[PDB]
Amino acid sequence: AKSKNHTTHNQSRKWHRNGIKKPRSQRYESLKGVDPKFLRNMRFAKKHNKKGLKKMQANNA
């Protein structure tokens, strides 16, 4: 009738068999969850990066 209710016995041994891996970090994480007002302004800045190109290359040269 009655049986065992709960245990975490052997669970850690199972967890470490394929390792407990840290999430894969990388350059350029996603912009999800960022403030929409800030995000749409950033998109406008990226869009208009096009202009001012000749001033940038003049200064660089």
Q: Which residues bind other proteins (CB under 8 A)?
A: 6, 11, 14-16, 18, 20-23, 29, 33-35, 38
Residue 51 interacts with, from other proteins, Mg ion, RNA, none (CB under 5-8 Å by kind): RNA
For RNA, what does the binding mask look like between residues 1 and 40, x meaning CB under 7 A? --------------------xx-xxxx----xx-xxxx-x
Alpha-carbon gap, residue 58 to 32, rounded angstroms:
36
Alpha-carbon gap, residue 56 to 39, rounded angstroms:
24
CB 39 within 8 A of CB 31: yes
CB of 40 to RNA, least distance (A): 7
Alpha-carbon gap, residue 7 to 11, rounded angstroms:
8
Question: Applying CB under 5 A, which residues contact Mg ion?
Answer: 3
